[PDB]
Amino acid sequence: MRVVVIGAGVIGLSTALCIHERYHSVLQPLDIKVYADRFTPLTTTDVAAGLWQPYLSDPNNPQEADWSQQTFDYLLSHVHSPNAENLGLFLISGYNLFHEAIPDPSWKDTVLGFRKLTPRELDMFPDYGYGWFHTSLILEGKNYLQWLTERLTERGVKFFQRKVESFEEVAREGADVIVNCTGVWAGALQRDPLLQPGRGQIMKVDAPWMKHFILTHDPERGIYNSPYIIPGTQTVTLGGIFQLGNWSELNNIQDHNTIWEGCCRLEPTLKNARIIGERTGFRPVRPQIRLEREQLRTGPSNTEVIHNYGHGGYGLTIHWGCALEAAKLFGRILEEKKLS
Amino acid sequence: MRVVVIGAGVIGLSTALCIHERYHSVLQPLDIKVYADRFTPLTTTDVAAGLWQPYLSDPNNPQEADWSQQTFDYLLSHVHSPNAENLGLFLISGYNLFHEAIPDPSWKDTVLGFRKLTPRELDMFPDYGYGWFHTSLILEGKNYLQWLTERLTERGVKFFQRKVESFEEVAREGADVIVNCTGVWAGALQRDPLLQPGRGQIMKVDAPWMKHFILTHDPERGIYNSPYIIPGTQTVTLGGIFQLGNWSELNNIQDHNTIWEGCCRLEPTLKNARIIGERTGFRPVRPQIRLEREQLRTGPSNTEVIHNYGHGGYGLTIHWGCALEAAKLFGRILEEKKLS
Ligand SMILES: Cc1cc2nc3c(=O)[nH]c(=O)nc-3n(C[C@H](O)[C@H](O)[C@H](O)COP(=O)(O)OP(=O)(O)OC[C@H]3O[C@@H](n4cnc5c(N)ncnc54)[C@H](O)[C@@H]3O)c2cc1C
Ligand SMILES: Cc1cc2nc3c(=O)[nH]c(=O)nc-3n(C[C@H](O)[C@H](O)[C@H](O)COP(=O)(O)OP(=O)(O)OC[C@H]3O[C@@H](n4cnc5c(N)ncnc54)[C@H](O)[C@@H]3O)c2cc1C
Ligand SMILES: N=C(Cc1ccc(O)c(O)c1)C(=O)O
Ligand SMILES: N=C(Cc1ccc(O)c(O)c1)C(=O)O
Secondary structure, eight states, X not given: OEEEEEOOSHHHHHHHHHHHHHHTTTOTTOEEEEEESSOTTXXXXXXXXXXXXXXXXXXSOTHHHHXXXXXXXXHHTTTTSTTHHHHTEEEEXXXXXXXXXXXXXXXXXTSEEEEEOOHHHHTTOTTOOEEEEXXXXXXXXXXXXXXXHHHHHHTTOEEEEOOOOOHHHHHTTTOSEEEEOOGGGGGGTSOOTTOEEEEEEEEEEEOTTOOSEEEEOOTTTOTTOSOEEEEOSXXXXXXXXXXXXXXXXXXXXXXXXXXXXXXXXXXXXXGGOEEEEEEEEEEEEOSSOXXXXXXXXXXXXXXXXXXXXXXXXXXXXXXXXXXXXXXXXXXXXXXXXXXX | OEEEEEOOSHHHHHHHHHHHHHHTTTSTTOEEEEEESSOTTSSHHHHOOOBOOOOSSOOSSHHHHHHHHHHHHHHHTTTXXXXXXXXXXXXXXXXXEESSOOOOOSGGGTSEEEEEOOHHHHTTOTTOOEEEEEEEEEEOHHHHHHHHHHHHHHTTOEEEEOOOXXXXXXXXXXXXXXXXOOGGGGGGTSOOSSOEEEEEEEEEEEOTTOOEEEEEOOTTTOTTOSOEEEEOSSSEEEEOOOEETOOOOSOOHHHHHHHHHHHHHHXXXXXXXXXXXXXXXXXXXXXXXXXXXXXXXXXXXXXXXXXXXXXXXXXXXXXXXXXXXXXXXXXXHHHHTTOO
16 A cells, blocks of 8 residues: 655644654555655745634534534643643634624634623724634644654655646556645646635834734735734734735735735834745635545546545644544545555 | 932842932932842842732732732833833733632732633642632843933932941941842841842743733642742743742752642643753742831931831832832932021
């Protein structure tokens, strides 16, 4: 059994991990390879602050709500583990700010200590009028990816830096099963009109007095397009940029100002913050995550493709549930090959 | 009128500030001076985490409840000013842990979003079965004292480094009013069997992923003697040492171990954190705060003395309340002495 995972983001490496640990003992000959065009420093998973928060309203598939819950409980059960720091995992509370009362989210009982904001809190934010507060978790892309790599390496999983042209290419060279975790770039190996880049730009800033996250929502600008501040481990993420269909992997001087202006207004203290760096990333935007099997007619036999992509702006939030599920599907293949 | 403030602690400096700006227009020859033995770098006020939190059970002086109140309100109202980073002001939420279900505090509705810990939160703290969660404030003394200083220097308030031997030494030399803000040392100038040092030892550690304060209460150890973890701006405070009567201004290898074990068990992520610094200090412990007048019979006439000391573990928490009250008592003086 030769498995090939394409993708070295969270989805790729996390899915790689679950399939190993769940099956390395039941399949004496289980060889798992990671093929990636980009690695630990240069993936979308690195631009992300890694704040756990799925969508407010239940999207396309309600099975997604579970995968978040799953990812949350998992991370949560390890917030105090001694390796938490390598994982880049930690707790953070903070604010969700609105202009009008809006229904509680589906995840209200997943996070810790959910509640509405009280008058005095809303006073610190003039432009906003209603909102939530709760404790969540942050999983920073950087450390997590690095930790996944270490686990995977001692696990025998070899890593190769290469660009795949086709599933056929890989199938053609020995793979029984291909786990497809190619993020926003999935289109290149198989057309999918429903996968678009939701371009984002963030600013990293030195402001350690900021201990809470602050997310703003606004229908005039839309999902992920109003100012947000997310204190990270070493730095604070200043963002609020979402542009469907923009493939420009390049920081924009106009986007910069937009980030800076809106976060400064939200939180005046940020005025004297030291700017540490800027990054641009593409959210694998899609109506629903493609987490399903496909059988590609390779020629003699066909090969087994598991897709896992289109995690939107919430891939760190849900990755784990997705990986458990992807492994379930891997399990189903095994039986169907009378070699479980 | 000649004013002399003894003490360059928070109490000292804030009281001089309050008095000045409230009276420099109406008292033409208002010459204020600070006399101190120790300044900004090395006072008790520097050792303080600066976490706003009165005691749980109420104080003798039901006033102290309003003073902390006005302090929180005052600070909370400046948290988003341009100069907040300079004051070392910012918001921080966190836990209070207990063994048994205990009554609510009196300041319950002063802080933002007070509430109880949910079972899932208590699950993160094995050794504790109940507690609260709320959003308080931190005013780090190091920065606060520096800000105060710069205010005062630009208002003409001259500072002198000298150790006062007696109230009369200062009276003898021309001082009309003497503002007595000498902290745990107040007795050296005038006998007070109530004023005592609650020695405290802390540890400054590098752990920027902790964005929550954690305060424990173990009755089999007493107030301030349970482990606590207070994230500051640059560094995290680790503590849990309270010793009534101990005047040893020196770190204790045995007190260190106690800090470090108590805190690692409270939060294991702390085990792989870098120890940046360590300090000792004396909480000016007194059954209640002394804040009142006293006529000094120095000869042909009296000199006025305003005492404002004995703030135990909550000087920062309360300082603004006490300083308003002292400028007030400074007023009474003015009217009686026909000079309003
Ligand atoms: C600005 C910004 C902020 C964000 N903040 C958050 C947040 O707070 N919380 C959150 O949960 N999510 C957040 N996200 C989104 C989250 O980062 C993504 O949904 C998540 O990283 C998706 O994982 P992935 O599929 O990108 O792995 P990817 O990043 O897609 O992995 C891509 C790897 O696949 C490789 N690859 C692709 N195609 C091929 C090919 N044909 N051949 C070889 N290799 C290939 C690439 O080279 C790359 O190495 C944010 C995103 C952005 C842009
Ligand atoms: C470990 C520890 C942690 C603490 N944490 C907190 C906290 O989290 N939150 C909080 O609110 N509080 C905390 N505190 C305590 C709080 O910081 C103090 O109660 C507060 O600083 C009291 O103000 P003050 O009396 O110290 O002014 P001080 O700092 O004590 O005043 C000192 C000045 O008086 C001068 N002086 C005294 N006598 C004379 C003299 N005869 N002649 C000349 N000068 C004289 C000294 O030289 C010095 O300049 C903590 C204390 C400790 C020890
Ligand atoms: N996930 C985020 C952070 C974020 C940003 C804005 C929001 O309204 C929100 O709910 C979350 C992002 O993709 O950037
Ligand atoms: N003021 C603190 C911090 C602290 C420590 C323990 C407590 O129970 C509390 O209310 C506050 C201290 O003096 O140390």
